[PDB]
């Protein structure tokens with residue numbers, strides 16, 4: 150018992166499989182998006198209530214909360230647009246086109262200091278092994294500054310994360326390569342082949358000596374950020390951590406979701422890691438070299454596959470989100486004991 154579970158609640162306002170659910174930077178709000186393009190904004194403390202609900206005419210692929218104006222949400226389309234939405238005022242502030250050669254805005258990341266964001270923009274799926282770009286923007290003007298070259302070739306980038314100061318950005322791509330960018334020099338500091346297949350999620354460790362990745366080969370790997378492609382540790386997660394996520398129903402009919410949202414999330418200090426499973430969130434203790442890393446807590450509560458997760462700390466309380474293919478989002482409240 151590294152945690153006491155104080156409760157588990159269900160947010161059930163979505164009627165379709167969940168794509169993304171992220172807690173805002175104040176830790177008091179959720180933005181959630183499903184595969185029908187329904188975006189919902191809601192609070193959960195002390196109870197669940199919906200602040201806003203909109204159906205996007207445009208398909209939506211990505212979503213990211215702003216870091217300093219914490220009421221602002223970025224939404225990335227499948228039609229080569231980034232919209233800026235004010236959740237307090239319930240209206241779009243602007244919508245910007247990139248070029249239409251690459252309509253799929255697969256990832257958004259806001260810099261900690263609030264001055265910039267990055268998005269990835271990818272060509273249409275055929276294999277996701279298609280060209281893509283990585284764009285740097287100015288938040289205040291909502292104008293593109295610059296685009297990072299990708300070696301050896303343009304490639305779809307699935308996942309982005311900044312470090313604590315925002316001087317580093319780590320990315321994972323469809324060609325299985327992680328690229329770490331120096332955001333002051335605006336160059337690739339480091340890159341290495343991380344996975345056989347796509348990279349789905351990436352993150353800096355709390356101490357920022359390592360980065361974590363998870364990819365299509367089912368592996369969770371920790372990399373030495375000081376030496377390119379030197380593994381620190383490596384585990385085969387259960388296959389239901391990385392999908393593909395399937396919901397059948399006897400009919401010959403099934404729904405299939407490939408990873409799109411975050412597949413892992415962490416507690417405030419990066420000692421624990423939440424992952425997906427068929428039946429709910431599964432948490433592992435990080436740090437240590439047990440040959441088989443073992444579950445320390447199973448959050449349970451899902452009757453359909455969990456496809457993305459989040460974890461945030463606020464008022465010294467942990468809140469875990471688990472989202473499944475039936476639309477349901479479980480909110481589990483964790484106290485560090």
Ligand SMILES: CN1C(=O)[C@H](c2c(-c3ccc(Cl)cc3)[nH]c3c2c(=O)[nH]c(=O)n3C)c2ccccc21
Pocket residue numbers: 214215216218221223233242243259263266288289290291
């Ligand atoms: C009304 N409005 C905003 O609040 C917003 C804005 C931002 C901002 C944009 C995106 C993200 Cl992810 C975070 C922050 N930063 C801003 C402003 C702003 O208006 N004025 C400023 O001085 N700063 C520093 C913005 C852009 C474009 C048109 C309207 C707005």
